[PDB]
Design a protein around this ligand. Sequence first.
Ligand SMILES: Nc1ncnc2[nH]cnc12
Length: 278
Amino acid sequence: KMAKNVDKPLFTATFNVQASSADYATFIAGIRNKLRNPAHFSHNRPVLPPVEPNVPPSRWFHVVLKASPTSAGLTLAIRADNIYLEGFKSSDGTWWELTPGLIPGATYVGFGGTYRDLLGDTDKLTNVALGRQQLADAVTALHGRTKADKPSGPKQQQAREAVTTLLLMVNEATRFQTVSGFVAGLLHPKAVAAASGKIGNEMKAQVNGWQDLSAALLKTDVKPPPGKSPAKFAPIEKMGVRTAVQAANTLGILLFVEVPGGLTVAKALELFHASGGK
Ligand SMILES: Nc1ncnc2[nH]cnc12
């Protein structure tokens, strides 16, 4: 069935694309903070609540990206359970969606939301230029989209690149301190030359293995069976992550994963609701 409450965000995070590096870090930190299950941290990193079983996706938040403090922003509709971008709202009021039939009253943008859909391959992630101008152009491209505009291959290619830019600079930055830190480091005052950069293979591997890295750290919290030794972190070498300390410094917020001996979906949602979570 269709998603619910896409129009009723649990919170809205706003960033002015011309704002400082520190304000970008505050913006990303605040998203993580509002997404977290207050009852579930791992090594002092927040864990998302589980995905609600046996209902359509019904927990959403909004990100608003502004070209200026007084500009109307581009609104992104993102799932609050797995931080998946599914919709965006252009200046003419049109909700555009990345999955056909998912969001009530939305218009399908013409391409899917996966990196395979956007890039052709999750390996081209290391080709995406990240920076302040790239962010501004991305907001402009998507915010400027109009329903009435006739179909265009070049316009589609622009939109795909724009969505990819935001996924890395918003969604992946939320998920990963490596990514958020990399992006914040490219953001400078106007007295500094315009800058951009591209992620390396470690951050590409992290982005492509968010569930794996999350589960790997979560397993370390599991109380060990009688007669056996407590679980040690298992390095994911492609991610450049070899210790739990490195995992914690890497993870911005963990995807909930059921690991043997860990919290179940039901139990983790129970603790989430008990701590005031919605
Ligand atoms: N639409 C999307 N939202 C979040 N992460 C993604 N990774 C690939 N596609 C994504």
